[PDB]
Chain A
Amino acid sequence: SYSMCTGKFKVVKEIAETQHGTIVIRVQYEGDGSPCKIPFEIMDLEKRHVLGRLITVNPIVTEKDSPVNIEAEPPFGDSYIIIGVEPGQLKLNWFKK
């Protein structure tokens, strides 16, 4: 529940484009603490540090046996995604519409 994850992160599938208006990134976690919280932290092209909305149930990684699903209300324009601590950190460039 508490401190965020320390391991690496890895997307296992499609980053669907739900027509309601969201990206639904599915990931699997290879790391130290297995019942952590997921370090999701979307940002803009510069890093004034935030740009995007988190739509999932406020999720956590409780397995390595189970791929953590994620939903996020991105902005209809160029933008960077992010998942995981500094080393081996997912840095998706969802900068599309």
Chain B
Amino acid sequence: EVQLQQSGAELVKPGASVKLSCTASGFNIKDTYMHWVKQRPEQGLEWIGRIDPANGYSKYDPKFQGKATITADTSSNAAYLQLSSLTSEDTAVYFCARDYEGFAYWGQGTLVTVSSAKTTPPSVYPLAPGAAAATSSSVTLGCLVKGYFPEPVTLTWNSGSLSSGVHTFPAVLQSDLYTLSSSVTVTSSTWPSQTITCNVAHPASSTKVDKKIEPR
């Protein structure tokens, strides 16, 4: 069909460059314009620039003209993003979109953290419920992820397949190794026999983890 896939989620030391990238699904890159919007903590999106696989021409927002440099490759159906000589807070989720009139298909934001301390994989422990059978409608359980640095962790449940009426809870930072909690209220007739799982992904360290939420 159609959609863009930005790459990974890396952690970079101050004063270095990163090479982000966006990729195609069902449309050639020369088709239309492609951008790079930036978004930090709560400071909503900031359009950085557009590029043209066709001409090969790209214009930025002046105050971004020194960092970024948008690129593309037709061999590979991707538009990249070289962001260099970065600073401590040159940290954000750098997105990439498509149109000219309103952006339609955006890619899975790619978070980039500028830091001096190195990446630490998380410690995901599954968390089984006690005597909690009674639920008007749904049986609930979960699994904890604690102690990671770049904050991106994509949490999945069963690789995602049911009333994945989950609840993912925001990170927290006690010292310098982040912490997150899961939550999955599966059906009641649905637990002890059919298997359950807690998929965790730490993009900045190339670490996927799948966990055992065994009945007890």
* In the complex, A touching B (Cβ < 8 A): yes
User: Among the listed stretches B24-32, B38-46, B184-192, which one makes contact with chain A, having 4 or more residues with CB under 8 Å of it?
Assistant: B24-32
Residue of B nearest to A12 (CB): B32
Residues of B with C-beta under 8 A to A66: 27, 31
A interface footprint on B1-23 (CB within 8 Å = 1, 0 otherwise): 01000000000000000000000
Residues of A with C-beta under 8 A to B178: none
A12 and B26 contacting across the interface, CB-CB below 8 Å: no
Helix, strand, loop or mixed for chain A's interface? strand
Residue of A nearest to B30 (CB): A67
B99 close to chain A: CB less than 8 A: yes
A34 close to chain B: CB less than 8 A: no
Task: Give the docked Cα–Cα distance between A66 and B99 (Å).
Answer: 13
Size of interface on A: residues with Cβ below 8 Å to B: 9
A10 and B27 contacting across the interface, CB-CB below 8 Å: no
Which among B27, B33, B100, B101 is the interface contact of A65 at CB below 8 angstroms?
Answer: B27
Given contacts A28-B32, A67-B32, contact A12 B27 (CB under 8 A): no
B27 and A13 contacting across the interface, CB-CB below 8 Å: no
Task: Give the docked Cα–Cα distance between A65 and B32 (Å).
Answer: 12
Residues of B with C-beta under 8 A to A28: 31-32
For window 9-63 of A, CB contacts with B under 8 Å fall at 10-13, 26, 28
Shortest Cβ distance from residue B120 to the other chain A in the assembled complex, whole angstroms? 43
Task: Give the docked Cα–Cα distance between A48 and B99 (Å).
Answer: 34
Task: Give the docked Cα–Cα distance between A13 and B55 (Å).
Answer: 12
Task: Give the docked Cα–Cα distance between A15 and B99 (Å).
Answer: 14
19 sampled A-B residue pairs with Cβ under 8 A: A10-B101, A11-B100, A11-B101, A12-B31, A12-B32, A12-B33, A12-B99, A12-B100, A12-B101, A13-B33, A26-B32, A28-B31, A28-B32, A65-B2, A65-B26, A65-B27, A66-B27, A67-B31, A67-B32
